[PDB]
Nucleic acid binder design. Sequence first.
RNA 1: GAUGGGGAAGCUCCGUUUCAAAGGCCUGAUUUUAUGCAGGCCACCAUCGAAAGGGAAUCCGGUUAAGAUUCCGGAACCUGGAUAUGGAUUCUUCACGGUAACGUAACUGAAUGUGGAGACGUCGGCGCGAGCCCUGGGAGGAGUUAUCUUUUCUUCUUAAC
RNA 2: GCUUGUGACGGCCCGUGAAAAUCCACAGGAAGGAAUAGUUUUCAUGCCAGGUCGUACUGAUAACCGCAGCAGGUCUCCAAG
RNA 3: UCUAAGGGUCGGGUACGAUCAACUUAGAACUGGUACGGACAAGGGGAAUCUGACUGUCUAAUUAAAACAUAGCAUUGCGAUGGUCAGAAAGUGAUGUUGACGCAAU
Lengths: 91, 135, 252, 63, 77, 112
Amino acid sequence: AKRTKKVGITGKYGVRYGSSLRRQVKKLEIQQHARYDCSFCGKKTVKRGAAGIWTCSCCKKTVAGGAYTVSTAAAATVRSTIRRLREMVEA
Amino acid sequence: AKFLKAGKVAVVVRGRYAGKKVVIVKPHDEGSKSHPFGHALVAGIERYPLKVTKKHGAKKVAKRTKIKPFIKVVNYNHLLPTRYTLDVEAFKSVVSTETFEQPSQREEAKKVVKKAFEERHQAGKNQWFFSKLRF
Amino acid sequence: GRVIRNQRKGAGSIFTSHTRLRQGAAKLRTLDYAERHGYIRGIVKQIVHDSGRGAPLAKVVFRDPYKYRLREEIFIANEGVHTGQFIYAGKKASLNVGNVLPLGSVPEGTIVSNVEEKPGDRGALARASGNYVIIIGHNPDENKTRVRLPSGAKKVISSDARGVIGVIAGGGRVDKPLLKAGRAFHKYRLKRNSWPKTRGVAMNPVDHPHGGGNHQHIGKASTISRGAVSGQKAGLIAARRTGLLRGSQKTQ
Amino acid sequence: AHAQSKREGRHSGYGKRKGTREARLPSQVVWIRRLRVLRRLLAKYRDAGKIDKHLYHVLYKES
Amino acid sequence: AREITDIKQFLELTRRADVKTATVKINKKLNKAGKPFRQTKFKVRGSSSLYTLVINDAGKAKKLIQSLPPTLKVNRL
Amino acid sequence: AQRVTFRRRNPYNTRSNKIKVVKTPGGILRAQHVKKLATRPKCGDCGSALQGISTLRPRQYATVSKTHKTVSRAYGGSRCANCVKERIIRAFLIEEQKIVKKVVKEQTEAAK
RNA sequence: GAUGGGGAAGCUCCGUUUCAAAGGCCUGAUUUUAUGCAGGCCACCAUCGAAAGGGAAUCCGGUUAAGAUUCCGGAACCUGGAUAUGGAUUCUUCACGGUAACGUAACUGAAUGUGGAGACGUCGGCGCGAGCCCUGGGAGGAGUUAUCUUUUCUUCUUAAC
RNA sequence: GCUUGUGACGGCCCGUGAAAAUCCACAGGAAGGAAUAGUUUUCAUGCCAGGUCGUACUGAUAACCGCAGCAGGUCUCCAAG
RNA sequence: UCUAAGGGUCGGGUACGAUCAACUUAGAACUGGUACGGACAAGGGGAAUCUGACUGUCUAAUUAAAACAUAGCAUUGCGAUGGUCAGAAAGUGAUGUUGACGCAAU
Ligand SMILES: [Mg+2]
Ligand SMILES: [Mg+2]
Ligand SMILES: [Mg+2]
Ligand SMILES: [Mg+2]
Ligand SMILES: [Mg+2]
Ligand SMILES: [Mg+2]
Ligand SMILES: [Mg+2]
Ligand SMILES: [Mg+2]
Ligand SMILES: [Mg+2]
Ligand SMILES: [Mg+2]
Ligand SMILES: [Mg+2]
Ligand SMILES: [Mg+2]
Ligand SMILES: [Mg+2]
Ligand SMILES: [Mg+2]
Ligand SMILES: [Mg+2]
Ligand SMILES: [Mg+2]
Ligand SMILES: [Mg+2]
Ligand SMILES: [Mg+2]
Ligand SMILES: [Mg+2]
Ligand SMILES: [Mg+2]
Ligand SMILES: [Mg+2]
Ligand SMILES: [Mg+2]
Ligand SMILES: [Mg+2]
Ligand SMILES: [Mg+2]
Ligand SMILES: [Mg+2]
Ligand SMILES: [Mg+2]
Ligand SMILES: [Mg+2]
Ligand SMILES: [Mg+2]
Ligand SMILES: [Mg+2]
Ligand SMILES: [Mg+2]
Ligand SMILES: [Mg+2]
Ligand SMILES: [Mg+2]
Ligand SMILES: [Mg+2]
Ligand SMILES: [Mg+2]
Ligand SMILES: [Mg+2]
Ligand SMILES: [Mg+2]
Ligand SMILES: [Mg+2]
Ligand SMILES: [Mg+2]
Ligand SMILES: [Mg+2]
Ligand SMILES: [Mg+2]
Ligand SMILES: [Mg+2]
Ligand SMILES: [Mg+2]
Ligand SMILES: [Mg+2]
Ligand SMILES: [Mg+2]
Ligand SMILES: [Mg+2]
Ligand SMILES: [Mg+2]
Ligand SMILES: [Mg+2]
Ligand SMILES: [Mg+2]
Ligand SMILES: [Mg+2]
Ligand SMILES: [Mg+2]
Ligand SMILES: [Mg+2]
Ligand SMILES: [Mg+2]
Ligand SMILES: [Mg+2]
Ligand SMILES: [Mg+2]
Ligand SMILES: [Mg+2]
Ligand SMILES: [Zn+2]
């Protein structure tokens, strides 16, 4: 029974702060509360609390992640960059 | 193969004797009116032979090397089978189903296995089996 | 006239960091034998939140090379590291995220955090949620290693200066609008008494160089010289250009 | 005496009402009351096999 | 602060040397469903506990009271 | 109708000033300042309440028997039993692999 | 906020583990004797700062002109100190039992190391506990009764341990 | 039902919501211990001791502060139909 | 003064019965000097201009506002041998348990 035409979670703030701001928050708020895939056991049970802290329901591992998503772009790019550089120093 | 045959060493992985090494003597590969699980009859070592050095003399050595044993009915699901293996012959008879029930019976079995294991330790046989597993 | 606000800050009274809750002070291992001849393993025992700090912290346990005991250091958690992970610190340690290596021993293009100005000062550069430094140079004689910092400034330091491979966790924390005074409030609540801010221009002249007048105005240039003296320096200090910054920045 | 006439449905008229229908008896109370009955009727209908487990599992999520 | 049931251990208690006093108490209660009966509580005071043995049976009571160490200042009722 | 009073000087409702109300043989109510509840000890490895172990306020454990503070097994009142299972496996396997990693590089040495 | 210190003409200012030779425990060595030395540790470096934070342990009944978790009575509990008697344990020296989660009246354990408790936001509904509220029968006492009311009112309690 | 206590959950955070005293436990195995008799005081029972200071009452339209037995101010717990 | 609907608990070989206790909600008659949220309790509404976005703040004792604050926006200084600030001095101090997704200054 589609409740809100667009504000979704952001409907809590009602009318205040301006649409544009409410929009920006909704984006990253959608990210942070959302429940993510575990790199380790592979159930979708990773969730936040405390920016940067993504810890996993069952299996109980915590990963240091992006402020509102498990992985930053720039972080992951660095991942592949290190990968690359690492390779160079053995082959 | 059926690696849980009657020579295998395996470390008990649960219950009181968790962490202690044992040997199988007789496997009941499936079933008991009681024990409805794959369970082994093992002879193990409860209190290990404490290490002994040059400085150790006379009656202290003979004391440091006393061994306290145990016998256990134990589910297969509770021992890590090992590649290592120890001979069973001296207490084939002594460790049996009949051995359990009646306390009196159990101790005699332990007396044998104790005299067995101690004879065995000195003269260097098996060595690893007398070494404490540290975890 | 009075004593303006920003000169009151210096005595440290109501100001002084709000420090009760913090995990302790993050820093690399002390740069000892183990760390500067070989490497040394560690277990991240817990990644955890330091109050008043955007970036999450990584508690990491190590053996003590000289006494039978466990010794726990406190690291800023690079993105990607995880409870249970092993961490290798040393010259002869290896190029993976979260390990710590002396700047001279990672190739150009590597990415590191918490890097030392001088070797062993236990980490100084790039500690903020999301920041880092990139190695861009090596001069094997006078063994330096040029890096570019978060600011942009390039700067050369010792090849024995240590850094940790990766990026600091919690990046992007600033893309989210505070939305309301309350969140800003709680923000500074666990930092220090710097919020909210009265505009000097709303003060009387006792209080400020910006103070007074019958409309609110600044009444003179708001750019102030480096050589200004306390009670003067408030506006755009030693500014060298001013106004909207048009055109791509990014230092060349 | 009054209480008596009350359980006979008396003085519960539209004009003897002062808190909203909600306050007087919350919606959710009705729902939980009702859903726990359907939910726990299914148990016995399955636990005795009138209902087969597949039908149950549908009726559950349908309830 | 203690309830006892083995009539032996009791008797042993009553010769325990730190035990200089005792006291019997008598209660009319009712039995099972219908009738009433005479309950009897045997209370030994030890240095750190007061043990009380409830002999429900009318009979065992009487026999018990004469069993009693003739050096124990038993407070009747 | 019957209303109670604090039984101690401390008049504020702090954690160390909990109350319970109680009916006494005199047929009246009174208060009875209740000790904070004790929490259960926790496993050093995982984090669970470790079963087998009694739960007392921490000095109380010195007024209790040894059996109340352990369970019969390597790391009794210390680790969560399933966790022992694990340290036991890991230890074995690592120490075995260790032996394999030794003689296989003893191979390396001669043939290289 | 003392202290090796560092400033200051100086009253004093700064520093709190700080650029310092910063201290003490377990017993052994004594059988001239009371405590010198033999080890081995531990380098933690004052102290003040909460009658709302942390924190060993007590209850009910009686009692006074006025005190009561403080007296009286009975019944407990904690901490320190001494200690013996019964158990348990050992000829397989340092308990057995359960496949296991675990069990128990016990069931030696120095240095050292490690773990846990102490020890912790807020709001929401859901579950349960207690005390209160409401109420049936009965067994007592009170009120109303020109008439009506198997009625109105009240007693029926159970502490720590 | 009402106060209140508690549990297993859930919402929130660029806020993730003290400290030390103190108590226990495990890893360790120094060392000490029996058959003509040893070990054991984390089992039970038994013995001694527990100082110093506060403790009345008021806590408010009269016991506090407001020149006062001032219509002001001044922290909190219990709470019937 | 009635009506209807909404629950619990028990045995059933491997459809139903028997009983316990609850105020909610809708409907229908009858009834009165047309009264009935009967006391108590309990928003006036609407169309505009000016102005501050909002919630919040202040002149205790003549000013509560359009003033201050805020999020949002923009600018400035700074890589530690540093920026800003304290001190008579110093083996001194705030920021700093800090490092540009930071601190400081408009
Ligand atoms: Mg042991
Ligand atoms: Mg001035
Ligand atoms: Mg400070
Ligand atoms: Mg302020
Ligand atoms: Mg401002
Ligand atoms: Mg401003
Ligand atoms: Mg003004
Ligand atoms: Mg001026
Ligand atoms: Mg000027
Ligand atoms: Mg002006
Ligand atoms: Mg202006
Ligand atoms: Mg609803
Ligand atoms: Mg309900
Ligand atoms: Mg139901
Ligand atoms: Mg489903
Ligand atoms: Mg009553
Ligand atoms: Mg009092
Ligand atoms: Mg509270
Ligand atoms: Mg236990
Ligand atoms: Mg227990
Ligand atoms: Mg001083
Ligand atoms: Mg003090
Ligand atoms: Mg106190
Ligand atoms: Mg207190
Ligand atoms: Mg009294
Ligand atoms: Mg008196
Ligand atoms: Mg009085
Ligand atoms: Mg007394
Ligand atoms: Mg007494
Ligand atoms: Mg004692
Ligand atoms: Mg026994
Ligand atoms: Mg500890
Ligand atoms: Mg802790
Ligand atoms: Mg607290
Ligand atoms: Mg008590
Ligand atoms: Mg309250
Ligand atoms: Mg939390
Ligand atoms: Mg404990
Ligand atoms: Mg020695
Ligand atoms: Mg004892
Ligand atoms: Mg003294
Ligand atoms: Mg008093
Ligand atoms: Mg009083
Ligand atoms: Mg008065
Ligand atoms: Mg006065
Ligand atoms: Mg007055
Ligand atoms: Mg009906
Ligand atoms: Mg029915
Ligand atoms: Mg406004
Ligand atoms: Mg005014
Ligand atoms: Mg004035
Ligand atoms: Mg106003
Ligand atoms: Mg006014
Ligand atoms: Mg704008
Ligand atoms: Mg100097
Ligand atoms: Zn997982």
